[PDB]
Subunit: 107 residues, 3 copies
């Protein structure tokens, strides 16, 4: 999947998490988000199409995707413990961090 596909998967699974009723649906959605965040870190967003992958700018992009994976993993740990509303709050919060990355690198 290209970068925009991975971002769509993040968007689609955030919507699943906010409507979820039990931990298993929240964890499954977070695992799909984690896979997408890892994939996004290996892809090239539009704003970086012609940049050297070892540039400071490309590294900052990949680190930003790694930050998303950290937050997704923390929300997975909350949900694993049965703290489903807490994991849902964490997902709502990391929606804004995902959005920051999306807006920075899209188009």
């Amino acid at each position: 999947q290209d970068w925009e596909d991975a971002m769509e998967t993040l968007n689609d699974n955030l919507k699943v998490i906010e409507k979820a009723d039990n931990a298993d649906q929240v964890i499954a959605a977070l695992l799909y988000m984690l896979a997408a965040a890892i994939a996004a870190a290996t892809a090239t967003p539009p704003k970086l199409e012609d940049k050297s992958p070892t540039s400071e700018e490309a590294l900052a992009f990949r680190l930003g995707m790694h930050e998303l994976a950290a937050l997704i993993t923390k929300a997975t740990a909350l949900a694993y413990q049965g703290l489903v509303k807490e994991a849902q709050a964490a997902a709502e919060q990391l929606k804004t961090t995902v959005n920051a990355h999306w807006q920075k690198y899209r188009s």
Copy 2:
């Protein structure tokens, strides 16, 4: 030897997944693969022994191992849902990707000058 060892762990656990009878057996094998994929991205394969770790070619290698981690994680999501046949099919697909990475970065010395 670290990269070759990780690749062996990937191949070993793909066989576990093919023989698995339930979701928990598949998930455990995928978690071992994910650990080996992450470890492999910190290793230097034979093809890159002489290159700067900050070179483009070394980064491309690391991102290729991260691609494998993403496929493994997706298979793990399928197995967590109970979609065992689907996770097994995803694993058969990532075997092809593991093979491609292995052929790209392994030592080619047996093939020199053929």
Copy 3:
């Protein structure tokens, strides 16, 4: 968020694992450790404040954190199979790794 805050989360959750009685307690703590290791790889520790983020020294730091995430994930696989004592022994090994990394990268 601090590199130091991620190191504290790793330290805290190693104590949780050492006192655990069952696999789910170990798995939850390992997942918090995995989140912290990933987060730490995106931070700049004091030792690296004077270096380019694209330097070999910064890359070695990030790969040391990735190495820690691999060990954490392997301990999670052990605990997922019910091998609680094995997972706790793996955690004792990564205590050493976390300590070494802390000592290396703290202080400018």
